[model samples]
Target: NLYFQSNAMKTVTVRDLVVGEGAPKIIVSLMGKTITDVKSEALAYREADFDILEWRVDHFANVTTAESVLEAAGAIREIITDKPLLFTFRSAKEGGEQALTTGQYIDLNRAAVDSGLVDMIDLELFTGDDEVKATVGYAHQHNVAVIMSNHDFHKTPAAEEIVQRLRKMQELGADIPMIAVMPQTKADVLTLLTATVEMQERYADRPIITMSMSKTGVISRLAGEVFGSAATFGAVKKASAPGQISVADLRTVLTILHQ
Candidate 1:
């Protein structure tokens, strides 16, 4: 049996929202630097009723120690209260704000798990597979699902390559395998959307998050249901990544689709 085609797809529940089996879940990010800034964004999204909140730890340069990282996670959780939180320390190579050693990357993610403040953790699938596998197991033990991920800022890989990256996430035990890529042409976006549909229908058993970044790929984010991407990201005040629509605008699109 093809391991890629063997996993059965299913919807996943996080708090009150369900993903992967129906209309896509709308997620927004926190772009703030300090605890106060993060909290403000959290509250804004909470009121906006976004399905998930991603805390972009990469943008903040102060989170150099585990304690600081844990503290920041706790502070955000307190305000968002019920919304699911995804702890993502996007690496510098992946269009993130800061550079980190492998040890530091592992340390910060481990702290997120240990703190029990996060519902999900995002780890890159392309780098350090052994580390990726180890972390996925640990997060599962802590009842936190792993969103094994990859990103290409300069170009989108071919559809087959993109499929392989996502399948590898599942192979490494991702609860949700995800990828984001930059598209240089219209064909790039179509290729990504086609791959997403094929994986959702013929291969993946778990929720998958895939997107083509920037203005060129904005349609992919909005067409999640049609393309088979389980979740889509939007911005609150500032977008953590490019091509994000505002939370209010995205909410409208999602509501229409879900209807």
Candidate 2:
């Protein structure tokens, strides 16, 4: 029973949108540098078909200030009242705009969990084992889901290596484990997709999200239903990551595959 895993993969439902189920859910990132920028994006996205709204908190110039972050979250929640809001402060080391100390990062996440604003939070996998685990627990205590994530901007690791990192995230109490990797070659794109399939079919006891970055790997983002990714990112006005297409195009492709 050593490899028996915790429980079967369960869908995460936020605001009536269930992830890890049928068609891959669409997540659109709001890259606002100020409160005004956040409000404008949320208002604009009202016309988009995004299942989830993610705030790229790292893009906020005053992220270190607790009130500013909360204010932004409140603004988004008001404009997009029906969808789940995912708060993400991707660190500078992980392709984010700013670099904060480990303590500061942990504190920021904790504050978000306590704010009762966001439905979920994105916690980078390498944010230290103890810190990440503790923050995940705290989030759960407040009924907040953790989208545990890892990003590799240079190259895709071996498929097994990618799987191992996902497995590690699950072991750390991640509700939804996710990975985004860059593909230097076409085969490298396959490497990311391979890891996604294996993780979902073999070891994953919960939903897992994966993507191969850039134009060469855009197929992976659109083919999640066939390959086992629970969700994919799309741009409303701007893309937070590479390989993301517009929300309208993303919805059309996902709907076509669903039927």
- Write down the TM-score of every candidate: 0.93, 0.96
Inter-residue clash pairs, candidate 1? 8-205, 9-205
Which lDDT value does model 2 have at 7?
A: 51
- Name the best candidate (by TM-score): 2
- What's each prediction's clash count? 2, 1
Off by over 4 Å in 1: 1-9
Candidate 2 lDDT by residue in tens digits, 20-52: 889999999888899999898888888898898
Write the residue-wise lDDT of candidate 1 on 92-180 in tens digits. Answer: 89889887888888888888888878888899886698998998888878878778889999998999888888888888998888989
lDDT for every model? 0.82, 0.90
Lowest-scoring 10 consecutive residues by lDDT in candidate 2? 1-10
Candidate 2 lDDT? 0.90
